[PDB]
Amino acid sequence: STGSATTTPIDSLDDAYITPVQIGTPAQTLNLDFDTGSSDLWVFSSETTASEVDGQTIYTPSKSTTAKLLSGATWSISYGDGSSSSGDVYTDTVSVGGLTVTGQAVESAKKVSSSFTEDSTIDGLLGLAFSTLNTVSPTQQKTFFDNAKASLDSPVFTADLGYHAPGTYNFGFIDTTAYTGSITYTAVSTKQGFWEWTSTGYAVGSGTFKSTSIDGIADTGTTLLYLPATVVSAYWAQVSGAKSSSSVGGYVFPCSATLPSFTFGVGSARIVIPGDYIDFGPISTGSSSCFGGIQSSAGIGINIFGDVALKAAFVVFNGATTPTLGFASK
Helix, strand or coil: CCEEEEEEECCCCCCCEEEEEEECCCCEEEEEEEECCCCCEEECECCCCHHHCCCCCCECHHHCCCCEEEEEEEEEEECCCCCEEEEEEEEEEEEECCEEEEEEEEEEEEEECHHHHCCCCCCEEEECCCHHHCCCECCCCCCHHHHHHHHCCCCEEEEECCCCCCEEEEECCCCCCCCCCCCEEEECECCCCCCEEEEEEEEECCCCCEEEEEEEEECCCCCCEEECHHHHHHHHCCCCCCEEECCCCEEEEECCCCCCCEEEEECCEEEEECHHHHEEEECCCCCCEEEECEEECCCCCCEEECHHHHCCCEEEEECCCCCEEEEECC
16 A cells, blocks of 8 residues: 655744644544654644644544544653643544554544644644654554554655645655655664664765764654754854854844755765755844754754755655665755
């Protein structure tokens, strides 16, 4: 089997991407944030505290003939941004663009933190990291991909995120028309539950490529590119007036600047992030100071190849017995 669904930026800055997902019978379509950095499929629901729902579409398990409460199961998750959610669990039928999993754990939110309530465009998350990170207790549950893997033509999914434009998640096949050149595959460590890999270096604009190992995770659920402070300083040094602001929480730059590209290494191959992809706009409405899309990972404990980096590539999440990651230019 295969599936294919279009993923769309939620706003003009590509702050996140939403993909329609059909849950239950008859189908209830929710727009979920596909997140290769987490492993819970959770949704706003008829059980979510009413004051914490503000425009999201909700899953109502009582209206689904295939929903069954997973008795005694609860979930609770916290994300890198200070955000949190928790609730109970149903199993139900879940489909993504033609690909159907029966008995998928659908985690129904009873509580969500402020940042989720305040984002009316995201109805929940669909985790695509390894199932070892799933938070359901006392019986950990499998991700949508884990449940679908055996039925797929090939045990893979691909992320083709667009810059200020729609893109595609495919399950079970590699669309060889979607990228240029070849796909370079690179080893993955699953020990932390992430798609964790090692970039071979970087370049700033047309500058010299620096060969240096950068361990990090491929995370479609993180907006920006978080890299070591030395690398980030080298990048912003090329932007007149750019500076790290402790008040704002990262590197800012004059909105009038034209940003250089940033290249990262995948084995001997190179992925080029155009400068425009690194502009996240005014720090507050009407400001002439703009927020940078490359930021230091110092206060994270891990480097994160988030959407800023991944959208510059066609990315293969290969879930074979020994998982690997593939990157192609596009």
